Design a protein around this ligand. Structure first.
Ligand SMILES: Nc1ncnc2c1ncn2[C@@H]1O[C@H](COP(=O)(O)OP(=O)(O)OP(=O)(O)O)[C@@H](O)[C@H]1O
Ligand SMILES: [Mg+2]
Ligand SMILES: [Mn+2]
Ligand SMILES: [Mn+2]
Length: 535
């Protein structure tokens, strides 16, 4: 356990009630306490899982993310203001940090506090020992699910390496005078080894905050740090699935034929690929028990639903995105039946899958990448969406996010690329581009077809298939694949003619070219242009 004087050390005073390492049973009764008000309230669903609303913030707030610039961070961080590409790593002063710390520590003072000790990183040599402090039971539940739950033995010798103080209920009235974005804040200090959260209740800030910290510390020690899911076959063949939010990393890694290593966040060291987390954070929008039975089955007692609409009878409307499109459920990883255990890690990845949801309907469902294309597409980090749907228009809107996760990058995209390539080359890994998004049907490729594509990548079918070169993007695509619909494999087949596809392909290529130009300020970047799409 821990004493109230141990919290004083952090600046939190007069804490009468400390709930250290709350059990799942305790979190359940806390959440369902009928006297809770506002966003603290949990409701019990017919699936046995507790549902909560995360408040005004139903996703991350990258515009409120700040990192203290000091002698420890100055020369290594990928700062928002240093002319090295757009990012959310906005510099914060030590003085302004101290003000934010006072807000949170005063807010947590005199309150009933939940303290969750956990690990970020499956390996003792590189894991953070994180102490999370919160005044909201469901927030403690979120981190219990999403971080590695220490054994009783590990708890006895637990020494925090990082402190996360969640003061969601407090705001910053000085934000205007302090040059900040809003009264809310998601702040990091690498000198004091601390994250502070104010204003936003969204639990994801804690998950993505610690990921940002691993993304900083690990590649500085030669370890790749990756926004990917990962799984392993019976033979010990490991695959990682990169991709932006909504591209299928959680959906497609949850494959009953494969043992799940992890959902979202992985390191790659001398020994192999290892999960940072102790749980999975699935999307539930339009969730289908038939399409995703394993994810659906995971939704039960100890899972935590977010922003879903719950009917009066306790049933959930998974289709209802009224509160948000970003409806989620966290659950501890063992809610998945086939997982790597007791420790979430395996060997070196030999299959590297880049997932993308191409709203432009240009990209093939699968193509095997060249070495240079792998690098080009990794730095590009493309996905798109239909932004106009609620208005009855397409509005395909592109996102280029370096390393398929620029939002969590603490170092230059190039540093992530370099270490990924080093690990890939030593392992003889191969890379694949998968479009889990749209084609000329104006509809998304089915989950079934995509799963059958993944099967073909993993089992070697794709590697041994006859291929030809898709024009413009110069992508090796197969003529056919076992278990896959042949028509869809060539992105041109779902339009009236190849020329209608070409119109869209030219548009998309120009976006890639315009976007990549920022990487050409170096000889290696400039050399990668040849691997990109060509008009
Ligand atoms: N062909 C397809 N392949 C994969 N997912 C699909 C497909 N068609 C529809 N989907 C839906 O797209 C979403 C993919 O979301 P998923 O949870 O895998 O995102 P993610 O890549 O894990 O993102 P995050 O980093 O935010 O966790 C799900 O809602 C899934 O039901
Ligand atoms: Mg996911
Ligand atoms: Mn007192
Ligand atoms: Mn993610």
């Amino acid at each position: 356990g821990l004493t109230p004087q141990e919290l004083e050390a952090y600046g939190i005073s007069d804490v009468h009630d400390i709930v250290y390492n709350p059990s799942y049973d305790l979190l359940y009764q806390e959440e369902l306490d009928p006297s809770l008000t506002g966003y603290e309230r949990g409701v019990l669903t017919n699936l046995g899982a507790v549902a909560v609303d995360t408040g005004i913030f139903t996703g991350r707030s990258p515009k409120d993310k700040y990192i203290v610039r000091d002698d420890t961070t100055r020369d290594t961080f990928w700062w928002a203001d240093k002319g090295k590409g757009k990012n959310d790593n906005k510099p914060l002063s030590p003085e302004t940090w101290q003000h934010l710390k006072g807000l949170v520590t005063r807010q947590l003072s005199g309150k009933r506090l939940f303290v969750v000790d956990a690990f970020c990183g499956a390996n003792p040599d590189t894991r953070l020992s994180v102490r999370f402090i919160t005044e909201v039971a469901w927030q403690a539940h979120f981190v219990k699910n999403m971080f590695i739950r220490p054994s009783d033995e590990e708890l006895a010798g637990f020494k925090p390496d990082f402190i996360v103080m969640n003061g969601a209920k407090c705001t910053n009235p000085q934000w205007k005078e302090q040059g900040l974005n809003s009264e809310n804040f998601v702040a990091f200090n690498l000198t004091e080894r601390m994250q502070l959260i104010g204003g936003t209740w969204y639990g994801g800030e804690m998950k993505s905050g610690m990921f940002s910290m691993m993304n900083y510390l690990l590649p500085l020690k030669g370890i790749a740090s990756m926004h990917c899911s990962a799984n392993v076959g019976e033979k010990g063949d490991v695959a990682v699935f990169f991709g932006l939010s909504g591209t299928g990393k959680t959906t497609l890694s949850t494959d009953p034929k494969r043992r799940l290593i992890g959902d979202d966040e992985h390191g790659w060291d001398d020994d192999g690929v290892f999960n940072f987390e102790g749980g999975c954070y699935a999307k539930t929008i339009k969730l289908s028990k038939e399409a995703e039975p394993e994810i659906y089955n995971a939704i039960r007692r100890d899972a935590l639903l977010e922003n879903v609409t719950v009917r009066e009878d306790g049933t959930i409307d998974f289709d209802d995105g009224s509160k948000t499109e970003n409806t989620r459920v966290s659950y501890p990883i063992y809610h998945i039946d086939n997982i790597v255990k007791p420790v979430s890690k395996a060997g070196h990845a030999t299959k590297v899958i880049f997932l993308t949801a191409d709203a432009f309907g240009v990209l093939p469902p699968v193509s095997r990448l060249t070495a240079d294309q792998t690098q080009y597409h990794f730095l590009s980090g493309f996905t798109a969406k239909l932004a106009g749907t609620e208005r009855g228009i397409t509005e395909p809107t592109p996102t280029f996010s370096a390393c398929f996760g620029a939002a969590f990058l603490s170092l230059h995209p190039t540093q992530y690329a370099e270490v990924l390539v080093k690990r890939m080359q030593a392992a003889g890994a191969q890379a694949y581009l998968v479009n889990t998004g749209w084609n000329g049907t104006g509809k998304r490729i089915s989950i079934k077809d995509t799963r059958a594509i993944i099967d073909a990548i993993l089992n070697g079918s794709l590697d041994n298939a006859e291929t030809f070169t898709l024009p413009m993007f110069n992508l090796a695509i197969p003529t056919e694949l076992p278990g896959v619909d042949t028509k869809i494999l060539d992105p041109r087949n779902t339009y009236a003619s190849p020329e209608q596809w070409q119109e869209k392909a030219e548009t998309l290529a120009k976006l890639f070219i315009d976007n990549f130009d920022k990487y050409t300020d170096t000889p290696a970047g400039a050399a990668l242009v040849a691997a990109g799409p060509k008009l």
